[PDB]
Design a protein around this ligand. Structure first.
Ligand SMILES: *[C@@H]1O[C@H](CO)[C@@H](O[C@@H]2O[C@H](CO)[C@@H](O)[C@H](O)[C@H]2NC(C)=O)[C@H](O)[C@H]1NC(C)=O
Lengths: 49, 48
């Protein structure tokens, strides 16, 4: 904290929140793409679900 | 394998005709590399 944290918050640090399934042992995922949570597919930059 | 890469190889003389040979020989390991990427395809490179 005495290195990393910022009074607005240090948002240069991130994590993955959504995925189709759990990743493999020592398997990393470098994806920025939109997750589809709905039954609907999702296309372009944003959408419902 | 699971975050690892390896090669093994062998070389021999034979005087057959047009096919892979009727005998037994074995490959030693050559090199190992921690590449750690999904791999799904390959291609060979040859000169002219
Ligand atoms: C490595 O990449 C392959 C290909 O991109 C991944 O397999 C794909 O997974 C999706 C989701 O299940 C399928 O829609 C594709 O049809 C699959 N393609 C192939 C060629 O298998 C694979 O899951 C990746 N491995 C890791 C560990 O992320």
């Amino acid at each position: 904290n005495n290195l990393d944290s910022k009074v607005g918050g240090n948002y240069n640090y991130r994590y993955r929140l959504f995925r189709k399934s759990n990743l493999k042992p020592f398997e990393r995922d470098i994806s920025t793409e939109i997750y589809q949570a709905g039954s609907k597919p999702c296309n372009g930059v944003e959408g419902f679900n | 394998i699971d975050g690892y890469f390896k090669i093994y190889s062998k070389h021999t003389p034979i005087n057959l005709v047009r096919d892979l040979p009727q005998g037994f020989s074995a490959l030693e390991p050559l090199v190992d590399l921690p590449i750690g990427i999904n791999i799904t395809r390959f291609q060979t490179l040859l000169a002219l």
